[PDB]
Amino acid sequence: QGVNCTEVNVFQTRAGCLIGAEYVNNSYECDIPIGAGICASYQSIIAYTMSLGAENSVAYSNNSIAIP
Amino acid sequence: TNFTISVTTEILPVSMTKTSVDCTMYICGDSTECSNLLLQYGSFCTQLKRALTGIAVEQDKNTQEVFAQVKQIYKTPPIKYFGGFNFSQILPDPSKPSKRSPIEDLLFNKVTKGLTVLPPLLTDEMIAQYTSALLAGTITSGWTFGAGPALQIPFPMQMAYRFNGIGVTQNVLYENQKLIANQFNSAIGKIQDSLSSTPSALGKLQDVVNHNAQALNTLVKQLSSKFGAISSVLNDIFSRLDPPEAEVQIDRLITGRLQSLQTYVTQQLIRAAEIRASANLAATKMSECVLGQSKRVDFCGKGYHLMSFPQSAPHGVVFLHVTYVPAQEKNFTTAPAICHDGKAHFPREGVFVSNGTHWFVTQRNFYEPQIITTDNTFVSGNCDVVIGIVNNTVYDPLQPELDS
Amino acid sequence: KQLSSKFGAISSVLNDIFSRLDPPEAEVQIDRLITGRLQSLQTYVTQQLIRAAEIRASANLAATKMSECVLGQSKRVDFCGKGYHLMSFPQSAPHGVVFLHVTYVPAQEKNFTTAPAICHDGKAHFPREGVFVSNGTHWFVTQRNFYEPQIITTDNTFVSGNCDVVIGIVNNTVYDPLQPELDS
Ligand SMILES: *[C@@H]1O[C@H](CO)[C@@H](O[C@@H]2O[C@H](CO)[C@@H](O)[C@H](O)[C@H]2NC(C)=O)[C@H](O)[C@H]1NC(C)=O
Ligand SMILES: *[C@@H]1O[C@H](CO)[C@@H](O[C@@H]2O[C@H](CO)[C@@H](O)[C@H](O)[C@H]2NC(C)=O)[C@H](O)[C@H]1NC(C)=O
Ligand SMILES: *[C@@H]1O[C@H](CO)[C@@H](O[C@@H]2O[C@H](CO)[C@@H](O)[C@H](O)[C@H]2NC(C)=O)[C@H](O)[C@H]1NC(C)=O
Ligand SMILES: *[C@@H]1O[C@H](CO)[C@@H](O[C@@H]2O[C@H](CO)[C@@H](O)[C@H](O)[C@H]2NC(C)=O)[C@H](O)[C@H]1NC(C)=O
Ligand SMILES: *[C@@H]1O[C@H](CO)[C@@H](O[C@@H]2O[C@H](CO)[C@@H](O)[C@H](O)[C@H]2NC(C)=O)[C@H](O)[C@H]1NC(C)=O
Ligand SMILES: *[C@@H]1O[C@H](CO)[C@@H](O[C@@H]2O[C@H](CO)[C@@H](O)[C@H](O)[C@H]2NC(C)=O)[C@H](O)[C@H]1NC(C)=O
Ligand SMILES: *[C@@H]1O[C@H](CO)[C@@H](O)[C@H](O)[C@H]1NC(C)=O
Ligand SMILES: *[C@@H]1O[C@H](CO)[C@@H](O)[C@H](O)[C@H]1NC(C)=O
Ligand SMILES: *[C@@H]1O[C@H](CO)[C@@H](O)[C@H](O)[C@H]1NC(C)=O
Ligand SMILES: *[C@@H]1O[C@H](CO)[C@@H](O)[C@H](O)[C@H]1NC(C)=O
Ligand SMILES: *[C@@H]1O[C@H](CO)[C@@H](O)[C@H](O)[C@H]1NC(C)=O
C-alpha cells in the first residue's frame, strides 16, 4: 500500500498494488476488506470491486399501489 | 390556521481518516542499533499497531452501519414526476461524471515519515450510490422498504400518511397540494442558497479534519524536540559521542518519542470513541428519520417531523429534515364539554371551538370547523360533574332520515 | 508479559542487579525499570478506562432497548429489530445480554389501482384509516399492512368538501348501511 509495484498476476489499486490475485469483473459479496473499493475473497485468491447488492427497480406510478 | 414546510440541515460526522503509524520508522528511523535497543522495550509498538488497526476497523464498521442500511439498491424511475414536487437537487445528476447530486457536489466543494493515511474501505462513489438508493426507496416505496419488501406508493398518498402520523387529516393536504409543493420547492431552493452562502454551516466536519491534520502535524513536529538531550538527530549523537553516553541519549530520545506517540494514540482513541458515539447517533437518525416517521419531538429537527433526505458528505452525513411548522394562530373560545338533553358530549379526536356565536369541532394542529354531530362525539355521564360546560344543541344526521 | 521487559536496563530482574551493582549506582537503573513498568501500567489503565466507557455506553444502549421493546411496545423502526416489532425475549449471556426479537414482516404483495378519494353525490369521501384500492372493476378499502377488501360505507369514511379541487379522484357510489332499514 502507498507505492507502485513498477518500482518494487499484478494488479494496481488506489490503496496500493497487490500480487497473487486475479481481477474478476464479476461483483460478489466480499468478506476480506482491502480498501479503495476493492475487496478480495477466496474462491484461488481473487480481487474485485465489492457488490452493494442485487439491482432492483420498483415500477413506480402515480396510480398504482402494493398491498401485502 | 396555516402551516409552513420548513427544511433544516443537520450535519453529523461519520468517520475520521484512518491512519497507520510505523513505530520503528517514526522513532528510530534507519539506525539498526536504535532498533536493537527498542526491541528490549517489549511490545509497545505491537500494542499501538493493534490499537490503530482496531480504530480503523471501527471506522469501517461505523461507515458500513450508517450507510449500508439496506441490501437492495433501488433506482429512480425515468419519469421524475411526483405530483409537482421537485427533487432535482437531491437526485444524482447524470451530467456530472461522479453521479452526485448538486447538493452533494456543493457539500463536497465546501469541505477542503512513518505515517500512512489508509483510504476508507467504502469510496465516495458507492456512498453516493447508497444515498441514491435510500432516496429512491424513501420517495418511491415510502418507509416500508426498510421493514422488508418494498411496496410502491405514489407521493401524494405517502405525504397524506405522513400528515396522518402527526394527527393531520389528508383533506387539507389534497386541498392545498399545489401550495404544499410550491412551498417545498421554495424551501429546497432557500436551503440550497443558505448552504452555498454560509461557510460556518460545515463547522463539525471541518473541525474534525483540522483536528486530525493538527494531530498529524504535532506528531511530525515532535521529532524536532531535543527532549533534554544534546541534539534532536540520532546521527549526531551516534557519530559525535562515545557509546556509553550515546546509549543513554538514544534511550532518552526513544522514551520521549514513545511518550509523544502514546499521547497521540490516547488522543486518537478518545476522538475515535467520540466519532463512534456520533456515528451511532447518525445511524439511529437514519433508522428513524429516513426509514420512517418518528413521533419523537426534536429528534429529527424542529417541530413535527414528516420525513427527511440522506445526503453524502466528506467524512460525514448531511440530513435534510422536512418539518411541519404551524403559523397564523387565531384566538378561539373553547369548552370542555357540550350539554345536550342532560348528557355530556366529548370530542372523539379534536376540541370544541367557538368564534363567538356558534360552536364547532376542529383538529388540534389545524383549523377545520365542522358541525358538532353524534358521529364525531361520544357521551359519558351528565353535565353537573364536568366544570366549564356550555349550552348548545347537538345535530343528529340520523334525524332527517326518519323525519320525512 | 511487560514485566519481563528490560526497559533500557541490563536485565529484567532487580535482585541480581542489586547484587551485582551497588544500590547507589543501581538506583538510576531501578528507577528507570519501575517508571517503565508504571508507564505500561498507566497505558493499561487508560485502555481499560476507554473500554469500560465503551462497554458502559453499550450497556446503556441495551438498557434503553429493554426499556422500550421488552417492557412495552416500540414505535422506533429499525431500533431493536428489522421490520415491524412485536416483542423480544431477553436471555442471559456470558458477560452480556442477548435478545430474541420477534418481528413482523409482510410478504406476497399484489398490484392494485389506488385513488386518493371517492367523489359521491358531488362530495369527496376520504378513508378514516385505510386506502381506496381497485382490482380492476370494483373499489375496496384495505389496511395499510394487510389485504382485506371491504365495501365503502359511511362508517369508515368521512366527507370533507366537494370533489373537484382534489386531483386524481374517481367516480364510485357509496353504499349507505342506514338506507335498507327504512326502505322496507
Ligand atoms: C397560508 O400561507 C400561504 C403562504 O404563506 C398562502 O399562500 C399565498 O396565497 C396568496 C393568496 O392566495 C398568494 O398571493 C401567495 O402567492 C401565496 N403564497 C405562496 C407561497 O404560495 C395561503 O393563502 C395561506 N392560507 C390562507 C388560508 O390564507
Ligand atoms: C426543478 O428544479 C430545477 C432546478 O432549479 C429546475 O431546473 C431549472 O429550470 C429553469 C427553467 O425552468 C432553468 O432556467 C434553470 O437553469 C434550471 N436549473 C438548473 C440547475 O439547470 C426545474 O425546472 C424544476 N422543475 C422540474 C419539473 O424539474
Ligand atoms: C362564526 O362562524 C359562523 C359559521 O361561519 C358564522 O355564521 C355564518 O356567518 C355568515 C356571515 O354573516 C352568515 O352569512 C351565515 O348565514 C352564518 N351561518 C349561520 C348558520 O348562521 C358566524 O357569523 C360567525 N360568528 C362570528 C362572530 O364571526
Ligand atoms: C344551561 O342550561 C341549564 C339548563 O337549562 C341551566 O341550568 C339551570 O340553571 C338555573 C339557574 O342558572 C337553575 O335554576 C336551573 O335549575 C338549572 N337547570 C338545570 C336542568 O340544571 C344553565 O344555567 C344554563 N347555562 C347557562 C350558562 O346559561
Ligand atoms: C374484484 O373483487 C371483487 C370482489 O372480490 C369481484 O367481484 C366478484 O367477483 C366474483 C368472481 O370474480 C363474482 O362471482 C361475484 O359476483 C363478484 N361480486 C359482485 C358483488 O359482483 C370482482 O370480480 C374482482 N374483479 C377483478 C377484475 O378481479
Ligand atoms: C364523474 O362524474 C362527473 C359528473 O357526472 C363527470 O363530470 C362530467 O364530465 C363530463 C365529461 O367528462 C362533462 O361534460 C360534464 O360537464 C361533467 N359534469 C360535472 C358536474 O363536472 C366526470 O367526468 C366523471 N369522471 C369520470 C372519471 O368518469
Ligand atoms: C505508478 O507509478 C508511477 C511512477 O512510478 C506513479 O507516478 C503513479 O502514481 C503510480 N500509481 C499509483 C496508483 O500510485
Ligand atoms: C388573543 O388575545 C390575547 C389577549 O386578548 C392577545 O394578547 C393575543 O395577541 C390574541 N391572539 C391573537 C392571535 O390575536
Ligand atoms: C378562570 O379563572 C378565573 C380567575 O382565575 C375564575 O374566576 C374563573 O372561574 C375560571 N374559570 C374556569 C372555568 O375555571
Ligand atoms: C406490478 O406491475 C409492475 C409493472 O406493471 C411489475 O413490474 C410488478 O412486478 C407488479 N407487481 C406485482 C406484485 O404483480
Ligand atoms: C400520472 O402521471 C402521468 C405522467 O406524468 C400523467 O399523464 C397522469 O395524468 C398522472 N395521473 C394522475 C392521476 O395525476
UniProtKB/Swiss-Prot annotation, chain B:
Which cysteines are cross-linked by disulfides? C23-C45, C28-C34, C289-C300, C339-C383
Query: In the UniProt annotation, what is the result of changing D375H?
Result: In strain: Alpha/B.1.1.7
- Ranges for the region named Heptad repeat 1 are 177-227
Where are the coiled-coil regions?
206-250
Q: What effect on the protein does mutating E349K have, as reported in its record?
A: In strain: Theta/P.3
Q: Which residues are glycosylated?
A: N2, N86, N331, N355, N391
Q: Where is this site: Cleavage?
A: R100, S101
Function, as annotated, reads: Precursor of the fusion protein processed in the biosynthesis of the S protein and the formation of virus particle. Mediates fusion of the virion and cellular membranes by functioning as a class I viral fusion protein. Contains two viral fusion peptides that are unmasked after cleavage. The S2/S2' cleavage occurs during virus entry at the cell membrane by host TMPRSS2 or during endocytosis by host CSTL.
- Record protein name field: Spike protein S2
Q: Which organism is it from?
A: Severe acute respiratory syndrome coronavirus 2
| High-level lineage | Viruses, Riboviria, Orthornavirae, Pisuviricota, Pisoniviricetes
